[PDB]
Enzyme design. Sequence first.
Site, PDB file in Angstrom:
ATOM      1  N   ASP C  18       0.803  -1.214   0.000  1.00  0.00           N
ATOM      2  CA  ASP C  18       0.000   0.000   0.000  1.00  0.00           C
ATOM      3  C   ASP C  18       0.840   1.269   0.000  1.00  0.00           C
ATOM      4  O   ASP C  18       0.276   2.366   0.065  1.00  0.00           O
ATOM      5  CB  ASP C  18      -0.942   0.009   1.209  1.00  0.00           C
ATOM      6  CG  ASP C  18      -2.195  -0.813   0.978  1.00  0.00           C
ATOM      7  OD1 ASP C  18      -2.179  -2.024   1.281  1.00  0.00           O
ATOM      8  OD2 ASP C  18      -3.198  -0.245   0.497  1.00  0.00           O
ATOM      9  N   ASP C 104      29.735 -16.472   8.397  1.00  0.00           N
ATOM     10  CA  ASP C 104      30.856 -15.569   8.163  1.00  0.00           C
ATOM     11  C   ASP C 104      30.442 -14.103   8.207  1.00  0.00           C
ATOM     12  O   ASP C 104      31.274 -13.242   8.514  1.00  0.00           O
ATOM     13  CB  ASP C 104      31.514 -15.883   6.820  1.00  0.00           C
ATOM     14  CG  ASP C 104      32.521 -17.011   6.918  1.00  0.00           C
ATOM     15  OD1 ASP C 104      32.364 -17.874   7.806  1.00  0.00           O
ATOM     16  OD2 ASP C 104      33.470 -17.036   6.108  1.00  0.00           O
TER      17      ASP C 104
END
Lengths: 309, 315, 306, 309, 305, 316, 13, 11, 18, 17, 11, 15
Positions: C18, C104
């Site tokens: 919206d 990582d």
Amino acid sequence: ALTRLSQPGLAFLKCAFAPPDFNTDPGKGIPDRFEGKVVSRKDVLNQSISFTAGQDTFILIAPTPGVAYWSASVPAGTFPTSATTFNPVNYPGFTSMFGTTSTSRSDQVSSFRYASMNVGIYPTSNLMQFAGSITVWKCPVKLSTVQFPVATDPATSSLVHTLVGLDGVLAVGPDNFSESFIKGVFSQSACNEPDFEFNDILEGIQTLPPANVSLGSTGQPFTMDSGAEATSGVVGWGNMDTIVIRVSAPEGAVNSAILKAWSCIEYRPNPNAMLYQFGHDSPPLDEVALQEYRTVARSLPVAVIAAQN
Amino acid sequence: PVPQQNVPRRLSQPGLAFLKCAFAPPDFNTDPGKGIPDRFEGKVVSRKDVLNQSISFTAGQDTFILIAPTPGVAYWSASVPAGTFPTSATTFNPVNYPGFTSMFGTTSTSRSDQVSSFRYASMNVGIYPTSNLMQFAGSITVWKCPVKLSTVQFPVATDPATSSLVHTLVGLDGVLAVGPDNFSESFIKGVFSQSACNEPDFEFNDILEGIQTLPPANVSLGSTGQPFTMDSGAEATSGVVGWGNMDTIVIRVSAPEGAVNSAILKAWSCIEYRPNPNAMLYQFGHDSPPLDEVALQEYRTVARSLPVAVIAAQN
Amino acid sequence: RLSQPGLAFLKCAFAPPDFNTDPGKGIPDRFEGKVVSRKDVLNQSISFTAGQDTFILIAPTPGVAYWSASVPAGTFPTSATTFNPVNYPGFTSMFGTTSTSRSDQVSSFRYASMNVGIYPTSNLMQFAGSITVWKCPVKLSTVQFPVATDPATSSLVHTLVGLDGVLAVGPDNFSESFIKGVFSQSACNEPDFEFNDILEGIQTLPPANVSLGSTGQPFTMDSGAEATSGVVGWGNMDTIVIRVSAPEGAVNSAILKAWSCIEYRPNPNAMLYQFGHDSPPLDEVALQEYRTVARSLPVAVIAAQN
Amino acid sequence: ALTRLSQPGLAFLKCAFAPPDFNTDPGKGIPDRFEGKVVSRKDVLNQSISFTAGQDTFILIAPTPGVAYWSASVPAGTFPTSATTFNPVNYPGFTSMFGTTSTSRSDQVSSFRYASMNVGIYPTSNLMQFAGSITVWKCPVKLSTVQFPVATDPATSSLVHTLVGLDGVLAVGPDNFSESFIKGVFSQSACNEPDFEFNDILEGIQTLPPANVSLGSTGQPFTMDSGAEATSGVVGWGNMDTIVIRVSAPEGAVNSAILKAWSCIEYRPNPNAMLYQFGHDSPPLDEVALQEYRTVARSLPVAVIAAQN
Amino acid sequence: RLSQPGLAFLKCAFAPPDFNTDPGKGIPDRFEGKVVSRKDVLNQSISFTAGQDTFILIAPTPGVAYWSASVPAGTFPTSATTFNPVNYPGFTSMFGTTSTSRSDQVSSFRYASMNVGIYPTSNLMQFAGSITVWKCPVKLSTVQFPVATDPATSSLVHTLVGLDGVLAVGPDNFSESFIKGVFSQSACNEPDFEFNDILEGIQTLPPANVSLGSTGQPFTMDSGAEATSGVVGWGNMDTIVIRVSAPEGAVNSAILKAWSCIEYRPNPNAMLYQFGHDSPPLDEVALQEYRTVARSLPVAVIAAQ
Amino acid sequence: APVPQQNVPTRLSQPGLAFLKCAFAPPDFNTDPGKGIPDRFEGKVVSRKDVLNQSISFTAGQDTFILIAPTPGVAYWSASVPAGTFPTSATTFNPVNYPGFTSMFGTTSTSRSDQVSSFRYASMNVGIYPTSNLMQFAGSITVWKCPVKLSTVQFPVATDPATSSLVHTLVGLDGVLAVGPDNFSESFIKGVFSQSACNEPDFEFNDILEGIQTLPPANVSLGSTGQPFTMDSGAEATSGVVGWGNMDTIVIRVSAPEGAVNSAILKAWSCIEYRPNPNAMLYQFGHDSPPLDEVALQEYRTVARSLPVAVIAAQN
Amino acid sequence: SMWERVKSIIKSS
Amino acid sequence: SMWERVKSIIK
Amino acid sequence: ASMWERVKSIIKSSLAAA
Amino acid sequence: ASMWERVKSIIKSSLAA
Amino acid sequence: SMWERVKSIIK
Amino acid sequence: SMWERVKSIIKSSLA
């Protein structure tokens, strides 16, 4: 000034603190932030147990869903050792909700959270043959893991479940209730977390420690057993304090009583199962109800005689 | 049109004491910690730990120090050649708080005899140089990393084949580089830092058993995925008991060739416990303080409104 | 009454399409640390196979949009069915290209929103079928079973519990014609938000060298090669199940969309640490309104009103 | 006018005649003389069915507990023969109520009686490719026994179950509803006895006729099958009229719809089952409601279009 | 309003032991044929054993008072348990001496009441234990299974349905000490009173040459020799289950009583046809009061009242 | 401490007059007025009325027993025994059919349900009208009733492996072996008229049984069942047993001494209802059951209680 | 001065 | 719409 | 008194002393 | 109208007559 | 007292 | 002379 609390809060307090004072158990859920769809299960057990003379009987009210209590016996005056095994007593309707196979415990529900836990003992022997005492204290048992190497080809490492905190059953806690056997007892337990959290359903657990794992590699004092997979098992461990009850019977005594227990539990039902029809939204938040719950939990004693339940 | 159905239609004294244990340990004669003023009001045991260690830094090497939220252990340290960072061939070793055996036994499978749960409330550190103004040379850097404890799963070729699940650490890669938020100054000025809870609430954690080295024995470093190894040595001296919900402090001390560096290292703790009824320390316990919203809000506000570190003159 | 962060949280939670851009900037709870907020959007054009039923699961697995499989018409998934993932854009840039390289860049995560939508693209002369939607509470747990090695040991592996609710349509569901579309949301199933650690080494559930029967899972959840996708965690959200049926001779073509509002904890050495910021402070009114609106909304609505 | 009926009577009428016109809570129970402890099981189904072009599809809404309908496909213009077999489609939650073995159906309940039975077909296909019609008529099927000798050593006589009244499926009844496919259908059934009686639970039934008994020696027109004992089966047969629905589709027609079913059923629970917690007392007698039940059942058409449900 | 037959029916239904002589003379329903009413009372002194549990079933089997079995203390009946009957006085005078002669005097029956009570006769220095009572709706049904004969066929046999309720105490129960006694009653579980036929040849359930596994029953019911007892039918009344637990070193004794208001259809060749009479006519108020009172009564009550 | 306890708790209508007329006075009216049973059930039913006219001659020196049993499609069962005796284990009963049995229940023992699937009785009558003159007759006539039902008997068989059997049996047949205390007896030349009534508190529907041709059936001995005598039905294409309604059984004994010559005419009535199969031809003749009428049932019970067992043929 | 800086923030709000 | 429907829920 | 009475007393005292 | 309207109308007519 | 309980119920 | 008997019985019962 009891008009400051909504009906669900009062019903929750009534379930939590005084089950046997009402004809029908009042309760709709836990008035917390969660407002999902749950199924409120009310468990009641009516068991008559006779205590052996010359032996010490220990009863553990552990937060294992679908199981009432675990019991074991040792020579009088002593405490459980490495050769003591506890056996469970189920609530009415274990197999109607948790299946008959060790890998089928989540076919109806997937998570739970405890709301209350109560117990009571009502003696039924005459006043000219009884002898002994009743002791009640609480221990904070929890479920954890343990890692140890194994000598295979190639060698690896293992991770298995274990229970931490069982050492509190080997001595009487400084916070205890002691009285005569003919007086009975009535005790309750409360949550040991700052909030009510949903716990998952475990699978494949029958005896702790599991098969092929020897005692001492886990650090546990004794063993917990459940027997056949088609009758009973362990499906989880809630956030409650374990109640330990010891009943001592001297030689020549005739001790018998009636044991009762209650429990308000909340489940997350599956659309596959049938109990989904009775589900309803959890009650909304009530802060003052939670504050009074904490206050009343802090105010009450450890246990009271059966005449004041 | 298919029909549809079932459509829904001021402060208090415990709080001030908590803040004092959290943020300003060394500015008071006696540690005023009492507990965490949260909803829980059960039976707890409060412990405070302080370490006073003298250390001399080897010239030409880089020294790394980690203040991890592992109960009973003060810090882990390792040394690497100057200008570099820890690699796959580096090992960290612990320095224990006093009285480790009095609380966690002398065996790997005896760590839960006295306690079964814990939760942190504070964790601090400090460094005070003890050299003259002619010998020294170097600098001190401090930054934080969010290390957590998790599990890994890999297959193994046995007869028959199986699968394994072992503990791992996620977030250790923050030690291999300097974080953007850090404090860097000369060596002679010292440092003083603290930590804070990285969770929206305070929760109790269990006591793990059998953990001595990460990765465990008979497991290679490649399968685990960690950048380096954490070792505790003999079980009769130290071990790993658990991991709390606090951030890790990383300290690097660099010293060029020909430099003589010496200092004093300190640490603090404000930690609650859940005791066993058969333990000898059960009689020292009490009940947790009741709820206090203002303290719980000001804790987060102050923790957010503080610098990473300050010089030793502003402890 | 509310503040800007709370309103933005409501917007990301309930009404993504919206507004021009997603305004959410965090979860207004007690946590005020350093987090990285990411909004993931998928845009896929899918044509359904005629004569078969297609099952779509919207699971809280980071980096994966949805899982799907096809079964013969009139039936349900069985022990021989396997689900496969469809990735969000840029999966490898955040979760690496190896099964042991998922941590990582990030350490933990927590969810704030999850929505789905279907828009038909068929004319008024070839469409035939219906769409059914219902929700199930799938969680992640563990199972323990013994294995007879030399010497015999005991194992412990991961297992999804609550998957049995997929094989039956619940009494609370939305069902309409295919030409109407659908738009369903999801909400947290816990009293409060909390972080979950990043898992490592998980490719297929159940893992290799482990039989399906001994775990109790009705079916399998494969992920393929390690360089394409994987399982890195499981959030605190309710799964969404969608069934699409297509008779022989019909042509069904729709557009599938998915949204997300996720927070992370970045590593200091990561390349995305520079984009981080502080989590918004606490706001009670926003959380209360979130709970009330999530309780009062229907299961699903037609695509005409989204 | 409508104030002469008690609330249970109105609720019973609503569940009996108009399920899909209300949001929740179709009813409470049957207001007759019996006032024991019963469990009201409300069933609902949502299944998407596609009809093959060039075949005739037969759907039977039988009063078998736990099963929604039975279906079979025959070439167009024909009727079921001796080689036709009907397969069942279950309500959500069969094994959670009737176990997973052939001899474990009476673990949770012991008896039952129907209160309502409705059906409804809602078209889904477009207006440019559909073709065919829908026909509905009702047949009074009952369950009885058939005896015949067997040539063993020594020779004995066997008495097995059988279904009488199944020949009504082989022709269209004079009282029938017929209209185009794109308009749907909605139909209901009523009790075919002067009073509501409880029926027991049968065990071991998996196929009618059972194994080792050849069709033809029992007089049955065709066969009814339920498959593996772990998925579905036959547990009883209530006192209601079976509803027969025939959908015809010519070549080149794509037909699809959504099928919905309802059921108000009363059960007698067991003390050891989980269902006992949700039991309650049956409503008392109401004569006016019982009279209007018969009057409305007699003054209604066989079926209406889906737009008028 | 209430006629004499309705009052008598209520008296026989609810309060037998409060009057010098029984008042009941029939059921006030539509049926008005020829019946032969009968009241059966058993007076027995029983001494429960020590260190074991005793289970008593008051089942609607005509001519038999109750079934009993014993199990180790703190347990429930298992697959190795067997129940044995104790019958009313005069079984052979009505149901013959063979298994195929149970219908030589009557052909049908229907119950009207079924009550029980326990009165302890122990002093205040011996008693120990408790008494628990709950109700289970047991019914008679059938089961089918295949047999591997030459050629293969199928078999239909009788089977009790609902026996699983004896393995757990339900929420609706009554429990108290042993020195207080108990008194409970049952009621009809059907919306109307209908006659049941007389069965033949039934001695044990499950029958001979049929394993317990293939019937689905939890335990066994045995009646012994054909010349002493047997099973002749199953009425439409709920079963009452009583558990009495006794510890070791205790002495428990009591007196057990049972009542039954029953009706029969006689045969013209029988010698009891001369005692018959016509059934009382209809009475709506009596039936409504029956339903209300049966609904409003508790599960059990101490023997003092 | 005390143990806590929880969970503590007007004129008649035309259908009624027609029902009474079909039940009690068949032969008085020009045409049978029967419409249907005015109970609560108002479904689709087919109503039938059966009348049989048979001329019979009784053997001199024997006792003839006639059973009017509620077996659909069958009028009566007949057997003969020497005078002064009663039926024994060797006695066999054979039926006499109503007209059009094969047109309704087929010609195969498994075809009985091809047309109907349920039924219930409403009336049953019988009458005897002597035709012999006033110089050649001698004997009497006795009438009483018996409540015969249908049940099952269970017994084991020593097959390989041994199993347990379950077959059909008739209970209550022992009332035929002796004269009942409630009976009507008079001379033969006066005839008899009798009727039966329902023996259940409500009117219910039964089911159609298949395969029954004899009781006890084939390969089953008489001793195992415990019945006094057998009930044969002959060839499967002629007649058979298809059910058993909730009506009493009327037994008539006619004794003829040596030298007597007795002849008469036997009549039977039946006011019945059926449940028709939608594929049958009889479905077009069906209608709906009449609605409830309480006064009709009350007068039915009262008149059933207030009538004698039987009357002479002059007051039929 | 560490505690003196803490009191500054609390006094601000 | 949807945000309008949510906006009405709060009010 | 009973347990519910003492719980009510506790709650009433706490609310009156607030 | 709907079906419940039909049922209500039938009941009203029956009670009136 | 049982006859009194029944009488009280009918009242 | 049978229907009159039933009529008389009914009239007596109603009276």
